[PDB]
Design a protein around this ligand. Structure first.
Ligand code: HEC
Ligand code: HEC
Ligand code: HEC
Ligand SMILES: [Cu+2]
Ligand SMILES: [Cu+2]
Ligand SMILES: [Cu+2]
Ligand SMILES: [Cu+2]
Ligand SMILES: [Cu+2]
Ligand SMILES: [Cu+2]
Lengths: 455, 455, 455
């Protein structure tokens, strides 16, 4: 057989698993071992977006699940526990396992139980693991996937950083950024029409203050999975190139590519060398996923600029939108205050401030000044103040034709923004009204609901 | 030119074509030949699913069409007949043909006619062939695709088994498993929203008693096509690895991968070595296709277990659902009896038995016992017997909150199952009522239609 | 660093950019240079289909944008101008640029402004460039993408022809071929449900009198991009094979393939050797894109037939439909005449003539003769003349069952063609009525609207 390094030697090893985006250290071992893996399924509510809860089903309490790292030829004794608070039964299929279901029929586990099975890791590579419990699509859609690395016997070449990034498509009853606890939507899942496409199980999981880091001159290896369930990732790094891309345990290694297709259920190891400082964006280049459904992660490189290689500036809200900023915690706070019935004007203003970035600032500027004759001002805007109800209709339904703002004529087009939720329009407009010497007061989600219902 | 082995020699050869999932024997020849291919288009109703008929358009009476096997450098004299019962005209485009339309403009054939054209097979490889008659998408969607192998002059390396598997997406007016003769749906086809995604033209075409077979230690080569028309396959083998994947006649060979993307209209040769016994599942790992639309095929390996490689069990209904069992012939029978107006309680019970597997058994068990305090029993269930109408609402619309069943409290969640058709809910519940000392009687499709219409 | 050929030498070079489908000449240079690129964003209405206008956003006035050609190790001084008639701000992200946003944060440009940034071209290859202005998906969907080639220092091998072909998916408020100025549809874009999938920004951009050309024996290199925003191309050449496919600046080169997957935002260089004359069709083999949404381009090879390689005929309307003919200018004319209120019977007849090809001729023949007993005649048809209103219902809703036409019984099936627009049915039927000794008169779009509204 391949990976035939004889029976386990040394002492049994209790595998150290890591939560995303971190990876366990290299096994750093010259002999095959008995590796004991203990993984516990937890079902739990987490925020899939600010003020949006979802009941995830997880391996080890995270999406993706805990990272497993073994050596080709190891004997893996796999213990799957299902937490007693679980409502569903669960199991595991590991890609790279030689045997039926990749472990599925020997890991079937009711709430409060444990199952175990043993496999030899014959196949070197990076592999997806996921739940394989009927209905399989529902279990995977809820977050039940992760990566197992089977190292080659000599180990992978040393790098400065190893990170763990996994794409998933998600199906909520509600629309993108519609607030509240969102049920799984089986109709959207069967139709392959996700409301969110994410890295590491949430909007902003790898942006702002949760960006991945490295320094100019350092090597980064990223273990990249695609849990699906349904989508194929046009996986891409903005502003850089992959030194290498290797799929699963394939003999083929592609070098010097920027855009690579990762199948649903697929995985790849990519290598990046940091050359110049700034934010390097990992996306699904099926662009509405990256820029309208959440599929953007950041590798932030710190170090000296090299003007001979790139003379230009770090990214801002023009490219990264409301994910340029460290976090949108103000949106979470305002959503919680709406639920409690304690929502203040200032709660709305700080939420609107976070949401205004990119969404409105690309044309009206971060300071609401616009560009005289080209983009009208929101700062001290006579037009805004004259009719707050018209302002709600402009965000929902757009505006075109000649207008006069602060003594100047505009003859341009503001596209409609009907995909903004009622709370988002209300918070953005309350921010604008309470900024730049505008008249203050507030716009409520309920105000916007009535305007949406009759344009 | 490539494949320049001079003029045909020896005797003209009448090509032996095979129906899926079988392949013609290796050409086993050292000289180029004149190969005469005779292929006849037949339009005909076949079962796309149990009790679901569809009018397929076929090359040779099967989906995919008859497998053609020639040698690089052969002169192929291609005869396309259109059966006189056909309503549409048809033609053929073979990938790997050097010339306009791959044969399309010289193979255009009205019902009851024959066309012929000659081509030299310059290009070694595995290639899709399909109909290229306006509207091309409708002809391909109805089943008009297959494979032609152009062998290299020295032939392919010998293996124990060669099989023929081809994925297709299908567009019915009705929903998945909605019974009756289903028309082609052009709106779903243009939208790329298939109701079925299949191997070899039907649900269960390669599962249960129609699984592919091999023995521990044997090599299997699978000629894998993707007829589309629209989908890209994340083609994957559960519990195993491909020794090799080679696309069309590409110089590139990928080795040691589990998950590979097959383009719409693409084809690949994969090689598998059987290591341990059990069912190895070929899927489109765009998981709702594999587990909700029919895209699952089985390679069943018989032979000695190796507990050093895999300690675990063969797959069952937890993973393969209602395709674990040899066949669902009882569903076909019950559908026929509904049409005839002769549907008996026992017809419903045997259909419901087949459908209960995985769909209900994953939580309630194959024997309806459930798991005390975790999954309530369907066996001798006081709760079921108290209100059969409530049971219909529970399958369609789900159940949550505290209930008491056979003296025990449950506080859990049964997801809704509204994608089940009225006949499916009726048959499953009639099976349950007539099992495990439950009260008997029956639930009709019409009973379920009324409950669906007002939750 | 890679591409470390020292500082720029010689004179600064003003890059010569080309409009699709042409490519600038090889740089033909042994030293690294300072290359000045000047690219101007223009927003403008163009015909996305005959009689269908769309407001495109373009780099250099075309979709795809102007082709840029530099050498690995060049210092590129990039000048982006935004035309003063623009309503939106714009920027550029070039794949293959080493630095944040690929130029995005240093190229942000309001209407009537200019931005500049400098980069070293470290990475050899073919690369997509696109707008990266919030909302990024809307800018790319409107046409803001093109290719930059970074040549290897020794240059690419010489070929007879170099062409520029770029796929895009497009989202109109109206359905496919619905006439008038079509707004961008954000709902369809987010759902990844394009109304058009095109090469070079229009239906027929590379068909008929706009086909690419070469001669038997000549080599063709095609720089193939996929601007997306959302779709992955099953990129395929009908009737031929690619000698080579190379993605971006990848070390991997695939040889001898017919079907290759291009990611959203991806690019590839393909090489084709012309062997036999005729039309070679470039498609997205996700077949409803190629044959129902516009994703078909033609490489027309002129030269001597070789009956030893391919005995068959050039393509016609059976395969290429209404794109076999040089152009459909008559449809543009009839649409303009409807807007003006000057629409004549002859305007309708010539538009219907263009649309009848393939759509109706595949079964009824180019001369309306049909095939006695199999396809009924439209030529001198007693059945057509007896009830023009029934003829409208037959095109929209199909026809089956026994009929008698010109003394012969037919018992067959004409599929419904409800995806035809009201003007298309009206023009086709007016063409038929004014041909082949039929009674004349006309059918109006308004006649068809009333029949569609009550079958
Ligand atoms: C460009 C792509 C824009 C984005 C994004 C946003 N707005 Fe805008 N807005 C824009 C233009 C060109 C115009 C004028 C339209 C015309 O007919 O010429 C506007 C107009 C407004 C107004 C009214 C005028 C004013 O007070 O200055 C308001 C209140 C306004 N826009 C608000 C607004 C908000 C809140 C945005 C994000 C949600 C937003 N705009 C985005 C161009 C663009
Ligand atoms: C788990 C994923 C389940 C599947 C699949 C099916 N059912 Fe279920 N069912 C489940 C639970 C947890 C519960 C209790 C809900 C609660 O509020 O605590 C139920 C309940 C029922 C009942 C009523 C109670 C009883 O008689 O035991 C019925 C009649 C029932 N379920 C039927 C049923 C059928 C027919 C299924 C397949 C179609 C099915 N269930 C699937 C959990 C799960
Ligand atoms: C085959 C795939 C067809 C295409 C494409 C079109 N038509 Fe057709 N048509 C076809 C058949 C088999 C029949 C007879 C149906 C039967 O019940 O046996 C028809 C019938 C008509 C008729 C009425 C009969 C006649 O006058 O000959 C008309 C007026 C007609 N079809 C028009 C028509 C037009 C305008 C088409 C393109 C828009 C078209 N047909 C396409 C088969 C096929
Ligand atoms: Cu699970
Ligand atoms: Cu899997
Ligand atoms: Cu056909
Ligand atoms: Cu094809
Ligand atoms: Cu732009
Ligand atoms: Cu990009």
């Amino acid at each position: 057989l391949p990976g035939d390094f004889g029976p386990p030697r040394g002492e049994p090893i209790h595998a150290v698993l890591t939560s995303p985006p971190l990876v366990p250290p290299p096994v750093n071992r010259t002999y095959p071992a008995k590796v004991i893996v203990e993984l516990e399924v937890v079902e739990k509510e987490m925020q899939i977006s600010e003020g949006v809860s979802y009941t995830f089903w997880t391996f080890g309490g995270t999406v993706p699940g805990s990272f497993i790292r073994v050596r080709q030829g190891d004997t893996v004794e796999f213990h799957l526990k299902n937490h007693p608070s679980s409502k569903m039964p669960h199991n595991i299929d590991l890609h790279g396992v030689t045997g039926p279901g990749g472990g599925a029929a020997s890991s079937f586990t009711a709430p409060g139980h444990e199952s175990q099975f043993t496999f030899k890791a014959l196949n070197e590579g990076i592999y997806v693991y996921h739940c394989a419990t009927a209905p399989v699509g529902m279990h995977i859609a809820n977050g039940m996937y992760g990566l197992i690395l089977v190292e080659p016997p000599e180990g992978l070449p040393k790098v400065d950083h190893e990170y763990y990034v996994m794409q998933g498509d998600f199906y909520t009853a509600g629309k993108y950024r519609e607030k509240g606890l969102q049920p799984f939507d089986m109709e959207k899942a069967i139709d392959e029409r996700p409301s969110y496409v994410l890295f590491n199980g949430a909007e902003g999981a790898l942006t702002g203050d949760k960006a991945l880091h490295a320094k100019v001159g350092e090597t980064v290896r990223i273990f990249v999975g695609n849990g699906g369930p349904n989508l194929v990732s046009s996986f891409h790094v903005i502003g850089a190139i992959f030194d290498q891309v290797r799929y699963e345990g394939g003999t083929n290694v592609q070098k010097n590519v920027q855009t690579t297709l990762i199948p649903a259920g697929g995985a790849a190891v990519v290598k990046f060398t940091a050359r110049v400082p700034g934010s390097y964006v990992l996306v699904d280049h099926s662009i509405f996923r990256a820029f309208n459904k959440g599929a953007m992660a950041i590798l932030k490189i710190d170090g000296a600029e090299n003007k001979l290689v790139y003379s230009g500036k770090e990214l801002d809200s023009v490219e990264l939108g409301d994910r340029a900023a460290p976090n949108m915690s103000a949106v979470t706070k305002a959503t919680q205050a709406s639920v409690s019935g304690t929502l203040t004007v200032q709660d709305q203003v700080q939420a609107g401030r976070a949401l205004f970035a990119g969404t409105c600032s690309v044309c009206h500027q971060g300071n609401g000044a616009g560009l005289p004759g080209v983009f009208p001002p929101l700062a001290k805007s006579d037009f805004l103040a004259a009719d707050p109800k018209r302002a709600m209709n402009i965000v929902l339904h757009g505006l075109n034709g000649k207008i006069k703002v602060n003594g100047q004529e505009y003859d341009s087009v503001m596209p409609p923004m009907t995909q903004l939720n009622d709370d988002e329009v209300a918070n953005i407009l309350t921010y604008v009204l309470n900024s730049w010497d505008n008249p203050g007061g507030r716009v409520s989600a309920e105000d916007v609901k009535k305007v949406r219902a009759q344009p």
